Amino acid sequence: MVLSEGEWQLVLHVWAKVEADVAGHGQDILIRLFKSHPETLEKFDRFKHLKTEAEMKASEDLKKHGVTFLTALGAILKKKGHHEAELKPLAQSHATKHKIPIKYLEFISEAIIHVLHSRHPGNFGADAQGAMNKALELFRKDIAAKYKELGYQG
Numbered sequence: 001m002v003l004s005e006g007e008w009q010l011v012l013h014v015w016a017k018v019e020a021d022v023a024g025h026g027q028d029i030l031i032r033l034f035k036s037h038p039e040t041l042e043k044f045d046r047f048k049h050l051k052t053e054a055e056m057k058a059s060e061d062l063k064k065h066g067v068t069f070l071t072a073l074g075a076i077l078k079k080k081g082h083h084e085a086e087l088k089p090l091a092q093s094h095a096t097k098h099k100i101p102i103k104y105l106e107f108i109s110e111a112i113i114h115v116l117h118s119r120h121p122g123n124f125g126a127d128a129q130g131a132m133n134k135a136l137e138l139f140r141k142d143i144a145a146k147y148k149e150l151g152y153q154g
């Protein structure tokens with residue numbers, strides 16, 4: 001799939017707002033995923049023991065990881081599709097070390113879109129959400145092909 005330049009602009013405009021608070025968004029998104037799909041929390045051996053959303057908010061480690069995760073995603077989106085080199089180390093660790101099924105990457109895409117919609121309504125109307133969605137479907141499609149090449153899932 002190929003996004004047009006206008007779709008990438010809608011994506012990078014709302015991302016420029018997200019980057020004013022990277023740790024806050026990282027945190028909001030991971031919690032949102034864990035709440036919505038609690039099975040995903042089991043993949044993290046470091047956070048698994050968290051029991052409530054209050055425990056999640058208060059975990060410094062979780063917040064540090066939400067910064068790591070978000071930065072990496074930001075770096076991929078700013079490539080505007082040309083992300084082959086970035087995708088390599090990510091596909092290898094998530095498919096071989098962490099073992100993260102594509103279905104989970106669909107759950108986290110839904111969590112990203114929930115949070116942006118909550119925090120940035122004026123910059124995330126229907127066309128901007130369609131563009132963000134296109135960009136994460138592109139990322140999932142490419143990661144899924146990498147996964148196959150690595151021997152995982154398909």
Ligand code: HEM
Pocket residue numbers: 040041043044045046065068069072073089090093094098100104105108
């Ligand atoms: C948009 C997608 C995502 C991005 C860009 C991403 C990014 C990252 C980055 C950059 C790290 C650290 C380095 C590494 O191990 O490669 C990481 C670690 C990890 N990721 Fe993700 N990830 C994504 C989706 C997920 C999903 C959906 C899950 C689980 C349901 C997951 C599970 C983990 C785990 C288990 C680790 C290790 C955490 C720790 O160090 O203990 N990731 N991920």
